[PDB]
Design a protein around this ligand. Structure first.
Ligand SMILES: [Ca+2]
Lengths: 223, 58
């Protein structure tokens, strides 16, 4: 997250870290055993970390649980990035308390200029490299489809949206992938892709979660 | 050896932080770099050993 702020410990309780030896991706806790993330974050040997703030030191609210299953959307296209969504089942059920809590799926799609929170442990430099220890947060509005499609011609599908600032300086970046875009307590997006980070006229691109809700619930129930 | 082994490492437009290897023809070795998790080029290996077997000698 470039241009954000320190969220403050355990204040985004549905944020998880995906770990393969190191923090490689974000995700969202949707109930006690399911996490949702991006399909481009798919690896084997995932461990999910819940209750993180400083991902570099054990502060005592953590739960580290291995994934049993990882289900990437059956229609994920790794060229076009369409359907960049994946679900991870935990080996065992987390315990849910005040540092670790799940996030509600939306009932409808968010409109242009709704303000969201994007959070993550990704790079905090637009050009440069600097990965934080603590979790970072950013308020960024949803952009209009029409301006999203002008930022990225012929790359935006009905399952993407754009969020951020055409002026640049505030965005999500490498590390943030698979983490939440939460807008009025509901899960609207998944950090997905961009042209670099925090570039003028190139806002970030997110998976549009409101389209997948029926797919998520039925996939959760039958696995 | 081959020509893709001389290409600069490509992070791409996806925003994971995944550590991969690339052949650094200037150093004459395989280095690590951050791969964003999609649209990899061919100078992009999952271990130094794969990287060395393919490229080492370029
Ligand atoms: Ca920690």
């Amino acid at each position: 997250i470039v241009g954000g702020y320190t969220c403050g410990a355990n204040t985004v309780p549905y944020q998880v870290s995906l770990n393969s030896g190191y923090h490689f991706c974000g995700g969202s806790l949707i109930n006690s055993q399911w996490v949702v993330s991006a399909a481009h974050c798919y690896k084997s040997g995932i461990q999910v970390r819940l209750g993180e703030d400083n991902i570099n030191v054990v502060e005592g609210n953590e739960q580290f649980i291995s994934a049993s299953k990882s289900i990437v959307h059956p229609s994920y296209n790794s060229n076009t990035l369409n359907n960049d969504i994946m679900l991870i089942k935990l080996k065992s059920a987390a315990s849910l308390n005040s540092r670790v809590a799940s996030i509600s799926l939306p009932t409808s799609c968010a409109s242009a200029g709704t303000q969201c929170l994007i959070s993550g442990w990704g790079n905090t430099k637009s050009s440069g490299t600097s990965y934080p220890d603590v979790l970072k947060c950013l308020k960024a509005p949803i952009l209009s489809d029409s301006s999203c499609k002008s930022a990225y011609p012929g790359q935006i599908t009905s399952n993407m949206f754009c969020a951020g600032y055409l002026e640049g300086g505030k965005d999500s970046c490498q590390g943030d992938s698979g983490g939440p875009v939460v807008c009025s307590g509901k899960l609207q997006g998944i950090v997905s892709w961009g042209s670099g980070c925090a570039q003028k006229n190139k806002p970030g691109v997110y998976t549009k979660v409101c389209n997948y809700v029926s797919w998520i619930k039925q996939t959760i129930a039958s696995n | 050896r081959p020509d893709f082994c001389l290409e600069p490492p490509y992070t791409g437009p996806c925003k994971a932080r995944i550590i991969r290897y690339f052949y650094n023809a200037k150093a004459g070795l395989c280095q690590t770099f951050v791969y964003g998790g999609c649209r990899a080029k061919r100078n992009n290996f999952k271990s130094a050993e794969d990287c060395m077997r393919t490229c080492g000698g370029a």
